[PDB]
Amino acid sequence: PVLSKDVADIESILALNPRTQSHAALHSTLAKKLDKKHWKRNPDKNCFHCEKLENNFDDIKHTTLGERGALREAMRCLKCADAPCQKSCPTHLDIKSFITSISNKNYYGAAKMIFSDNPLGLTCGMVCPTSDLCVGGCNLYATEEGSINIGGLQQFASEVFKAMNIPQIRNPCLPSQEKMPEAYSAKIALLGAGPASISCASFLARLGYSDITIFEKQEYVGGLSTSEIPQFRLPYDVVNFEIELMKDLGVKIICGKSLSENEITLNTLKEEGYKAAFIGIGLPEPKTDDIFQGLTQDQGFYTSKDFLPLVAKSSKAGMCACHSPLPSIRGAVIVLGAGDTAFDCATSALRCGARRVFLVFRKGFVNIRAVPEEVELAKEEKCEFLPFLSPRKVIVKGGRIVAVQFVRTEQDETGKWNEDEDQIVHLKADVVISAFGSVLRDPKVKEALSPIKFNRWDLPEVDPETMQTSEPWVFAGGDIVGMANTTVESVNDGKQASWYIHKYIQAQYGASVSAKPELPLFYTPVDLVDISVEMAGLKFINPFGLASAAPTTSSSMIRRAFEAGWGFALTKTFSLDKDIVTNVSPRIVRGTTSGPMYGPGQSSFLNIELISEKTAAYWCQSVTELKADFPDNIVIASIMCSYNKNDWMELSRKAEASGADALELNLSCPHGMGERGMGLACGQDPELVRNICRWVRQAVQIPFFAKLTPNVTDIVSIARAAKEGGADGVTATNTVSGLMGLKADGTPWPAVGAGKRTTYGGVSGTAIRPIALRAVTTIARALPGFPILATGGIDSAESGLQFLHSGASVLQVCSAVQNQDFTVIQDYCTGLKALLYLKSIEELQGWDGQSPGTESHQKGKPVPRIAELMGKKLPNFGPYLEQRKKIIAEEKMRLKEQNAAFPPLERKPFIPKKPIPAIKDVIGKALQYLGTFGELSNIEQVVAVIDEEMCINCGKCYMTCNDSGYQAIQFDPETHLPTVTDTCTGCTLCLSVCPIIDCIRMVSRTTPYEPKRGLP
């Protein structure tokens, strides 16, 4: 047969494979009109009908992220200096740092940074109106691709930490309870269990106060987060999660107790010995209108204060002991107002079975104060909007509302608003929901706050800086003060109040506090993990250090690195005065190794930089200064001489004498003849390496390490030469010999001088990580126990741990700091603590480090595991999507009677059930899996299998198998769903190109396997 031609069966499987076309395509406009609907993904502009949402409380947020999408967005963030997003965050979150942590896969460290400044961090990630806060200031707004989804990233990192089931601990900088001064046992009362009080009580507990009680009126906790924000924006178990973190600190909550003239008053608090009080009861009553007096819920009328708690009680499992039904909202619904509560009323009414929702407001569209986040949800659910209408009268017939009459408004000269008596609208309705805002009106509650001063807004007056009322021992914050409009501002009110309550209580016991306010960070048991390590007789407080390179250009930069937390540092390579050099410029350029992606996260750099331009006298004085001020931080002096015994002995002794803990020998100097085509660098010839090491070993008594080039046939040869010469370890590796490319006219970059000259340079960064990782592993297997200092693409705790697993003991970093700044050390440390701690948790063994097992999702939202949706060839577009939504909707209806909510889950943390590993316990554990090719099994073959529910129908697996594989994948012409057939060889290309993490998995082959031989 013709071996170079596909048989019919294979020609058929390739039917959809791309081919170069030779003509323009003919398709009629009508034919295209009919075919458009088959593929449609987004809303149809011609559809006027709301999709049925009855009793559907699934997440409708556009900002929710799964891990794949979060990692992408986190790498996109520029991680800016003095970031404007943080300035625009009411709780001043270090967004630069937590997003950096996410891009580094360090989700614990992101959450810790988030909850450090905001103890309701998962709530706020979900509900902050970020367009009017952090996101509104994002520098990436000045790009076509737009601002960063800060809220969703906050939500993602915080969800992962929640799944970790790790508890908050007592501030570990505090003395033992025993030894705490008596002022910290002061009895503290907080009123109302909402965001304001939860924040305040948390920070007070962080400071060490041991007798903190929140008195809550209702039998549920969390305030409006629980009673009114919809389940389909904020799930109740988020609220429960953040309450339990606060309770880990010892804060008490007593439900069913009210601030009210006949119960809790300031007077009674004072009679019972309380030393300070925080008022965070919010705005508990609806703003009402005379037009609606006497209307009952059963006639069809609700305020937002009546309607939203009813819906929350029915849909939020565990909110109440009573299971309660969903309100019977049938027919046409009018929502009054254009604030953000009105839009939640409109969307919640759809969940209760409304046929039609009208939002009616008295001003225009240009006057809607609602954030567009919120407006879009109502718009995409086909609510109707009516402006310039003021209510005048509700029509009641036969005991139920039948219509509302309105008058038109308009804006005049002044801009003052008028009402047009002659211009009326008679709007039919069966239900009316007023969303006019909220107030504090109840005289009995107001009297319980006597005698604090109220302002003309009829709310307690406070000092905006301290949150103190006119009674020095009473503070207030949140909605009740009237400045906060958002959850995060109310959190910030309690946070601000916490410092000044603390100041007040200490002063009542005769003790002062610092004039600089200093609230503690957030802590868990992860932060107590020991990540020190011992290497070549030296003690490293953590395994991360700065490589000899541009971040160590000046010893003042090493100083700031140590102040930030880096365990050790290398001096930039320096030489004797005879060998002074002068750098050229330009000399450091971005790598082209991952295409034209500019800004953060460059996948490589190339440099043509020489040794330090600073003298040996400078570096030696500097090393002495650094070791004087930072005795616990390791300083290694990097030095270079030419091939000359007296110079190497002179320079090493000079550096030893200065107080270096150790030396690093830079083997990059060129030698004599070249001789046997064995490179021009000293470090390429094992005989020169061995001699150089022998010289230094004679001269000094401190440890010294030889820094090895990867640009050799066998690096194990030069490693063993170094050991044979006396070295105490090796550093693996320096940069890879390379050229970063040319402009289109042929001129290089870097291009030096008018002649546009370059020379070969050194490639660094994550593009050389496979090379340095191979070098470390290969030295670690050939020279067991020989200390290795790893260098090459280390940019995270996770990548660092790969190098530790491969035999290295400590971790040098250059390019990752070039891509950022010194503060990445805090990410690296908390990340490594979290990775070691997680090894002790049985319940998380299925995770890969800090990543949960990937489950079936679309757009990071869990696929409904319904019977009728699965196995049934329904991709997420076109008429198949319509059928999916019809299936989901009927199940939600079946879910309204098949009605359970009585198996929640006490949230108890995972306890370590094995000891937490130290660095010495993990070093070199990967080597057991490394071997020759003959040691790999060829009996145990795998095949690919595709999860249809996670597929996004791109066909890349199909194109890759067609033009780089075995033509083993069927791609359906109607559903664009792939299926791996039995001809799969398990090569694993398809999985490698798929854009959805874990959509394709390799599994053990169960059918007989036969290699394809072409001919017998």
Added chain:
Amino acid sequence: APVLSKDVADIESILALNPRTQSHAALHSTLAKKLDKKHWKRNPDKNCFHCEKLENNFDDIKHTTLGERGALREAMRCLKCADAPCQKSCPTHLDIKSFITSISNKNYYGAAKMIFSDNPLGLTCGMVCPTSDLCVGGCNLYATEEGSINIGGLQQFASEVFKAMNIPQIRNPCLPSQEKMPEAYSAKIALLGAGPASISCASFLARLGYSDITIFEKQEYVGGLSTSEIPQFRLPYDVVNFEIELMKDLGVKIICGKSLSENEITLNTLKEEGYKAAFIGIGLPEPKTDDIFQGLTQDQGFYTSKDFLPLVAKSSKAGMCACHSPLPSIRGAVIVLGAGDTAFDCATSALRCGARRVFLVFRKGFVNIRAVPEEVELAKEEKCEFLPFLSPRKVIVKGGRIVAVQFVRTEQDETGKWNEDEDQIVHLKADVVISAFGSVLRDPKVKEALSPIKFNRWDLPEVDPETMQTSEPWVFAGGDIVGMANTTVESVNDGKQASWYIHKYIQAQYGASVSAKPELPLFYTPVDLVDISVEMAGLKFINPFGLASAAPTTSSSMIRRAFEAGWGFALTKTFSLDKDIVTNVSPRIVRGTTSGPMYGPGQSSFLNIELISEKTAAYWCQSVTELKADFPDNIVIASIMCSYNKNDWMELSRKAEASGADALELNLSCPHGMGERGMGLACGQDPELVRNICRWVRQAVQIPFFAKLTPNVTDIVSIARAAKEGGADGVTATNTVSGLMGLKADGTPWPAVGAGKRTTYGGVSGTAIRPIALRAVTTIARALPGFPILATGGIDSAESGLQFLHSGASVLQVCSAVQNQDFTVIQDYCTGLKALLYLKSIEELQGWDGQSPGTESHQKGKPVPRIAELMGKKLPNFGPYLEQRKKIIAEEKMRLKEQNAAFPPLERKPFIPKKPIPAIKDVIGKALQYLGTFGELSNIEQVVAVIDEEMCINCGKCYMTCNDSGYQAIQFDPETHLPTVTDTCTGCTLCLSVCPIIDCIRMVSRTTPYEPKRGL
């Protein structure tokens, strides 16, 4: 000395905004946060009730416009899907996959050629297509959190680049010379109306070869609604002109001032004058009117959209008219009636005329608005008001001017039927009224001129919807006039569809048949005539691109399909003698981690542990015979491997020669000896072994052969020299780099084979190893000038291919870019290389880098206003500074108004090549002269960085990179977040390398005295 390792006061203060690690939570009162948010605001303010001023401001407001930086990033993101649904959803069926692929590869000519092949109005459409209802509505990436691709903006960018290139369209180069075309092609063809439908029809007819095509246009201007009504701030008029001149390149004639009308042009007069075919493309020329508006005049303030929008167009589009038109003075309140897309253009255009307020008033509800959300968003963002459920009834006129319009309320019932309530009236004040009720064909003289064709119930010409033929077989019709098309792209498609069947009709009238499958020609320019052949080692290649010996050449049927796609040459997968049969393991090919957790397209590397071909030598030898029989012009090179055995290498090389291989490639990867005498394990790492193998093969075969080198050697030049001494005719540089691609957090590797989860060192391929392959190719070409080089290692575009040619290679092998995609990238590489060579002959484009225009100062890809008071004033694009920029820009627009001069739109004439177009032999090795030793690099010509404040996006990355990786030389202003490079810059170039805006930072000659920093 002082303290050398501490920053002096002046440095300390430069470092003021440098990130530092945090030990405490930050206290900031909520009030202070409210008062600081305003300073950093980038995006719209929900509290802003007030449109900025836009009178006489016709700048681009499109959300989708892209600069190169943004376009590359979005093109890189596209999944480049098989059987793409975006293309399914495009009415002209553009190959979106291909053209976006070309954009990601920097091949803007290829992208534009692919666009205009199927859409002769490709630039217009990229600007104005309602993509959310078309191609973007079907995009698979809608199913990710980051959302669908900006297809229109990508199409705009590539077409805009091609426009600047000033390359003309050429006559279809497959046609015979005009002199020997059949007589049928000289048939006189008439088209009526010079809008999109006729421009597209005439273009495609001219492509087919017809030489006598005339468009008769009623007005004095050409372009249809693209000219007369679509606003300048969405579609600049020079776009329309550019597309018209592309038509005229094909010889189509346009005659203005003559109408399809009684007493002018009629089908009867066309027939009598010998016209053989006619296409009616006159659109809908008249406004749909309402009896309520009878008698009202422009003087009173009434317009239809057909009156108003051409008035604004005439005044704002330079080159429409000879009449410098005064902008209609539209002061006060404007009512626009309707909610189709024309209404929204009237709204935004009214503001440009000085309207104080605009009311869009429509007779149904919001859910019933038919306009695409992109069009609505523009009016809503500019603060137009929207009034639903109003039907107009009376227009009140006082003092010769409209003073008000009064309406009645509309309503729906059960039946879905729309009623008007007489008792529910709105009296709205207004000075100007513009009806946007749609357009119609109503002139009796025009319809009469179409006699006797049949008209349907909507009084429109009936067509067969597949052929666009009217009831008269020689008369065709398309566009708005047929009532099917709603868009520019569908109108273009109507003319495209009609052109095939006009061709069929005309050829039949001259007694000739046409093919049963429609074959419209593609779009061609002189670039397509560029020769990209190359000779090397006695072999002729039709282009320099080939498939490397790898997974894309797993089977010979795959090679066959690659040759059918256009590939110049191909390597077999390495094969060997039967006794050397192997068996692959699995998994064995995985994705690179070299650029972080980015999944899907454009993987920066792969790692493989694959062996030689599992298929026999007999299969490969037979396959090479069949491929050479069927593709005599494509080079087939057999890749072969034996152990270090003379008889084996002679036997296998003779077998491959006898099969018909053009040449052989010796895979020097086999082991021999134990391996680390400085020369490792594989034969390719020892020069003596390479010399001997090449001697053996040279004795055995007379066809050329090349040794494939491994980069895993101390000195790759010595291996190339040894091969050359042994008789090789060239070297392939290089194979994969040995590496280990990473470990999971538990220490297991990937790939992991078997239950033991074992692995071995693999080979790294793709763009992450390009610097290594580029260096190897460069060092060989300089050490052994003229010795042929086949380059491999990360080649993924014509641009990167030319880098390797410039560096001394003659041909280019690809593997990983195909694994990332499919075989059809070859068409991108060929057109890209043609364009790069063509442009080297164009004097006017000498400032570009290849196909990249020089970067002009921009924000979000829109050129910043060159206004004096806007420049150097320290006005970043946020906060109170943005608001000042907006005032200054609007004042300048106003000064440009009261002087109404300047109407000189440059006439368009193509750039002529001034020297011959370079061949491949012209460019080979031409960059090598820029390489040198370090000692030939000048240290007297230093540079410094300089920042363009107008392009900056205020991230401070330059600042943090210079602070923690440089010389603390940048001042970052704490209020404006603008950086300034100071005189302490060393030109190291790190800041430029990390900046996210292409060319925002430039390295310029240093003009101040330079002292290296010696610290001493």
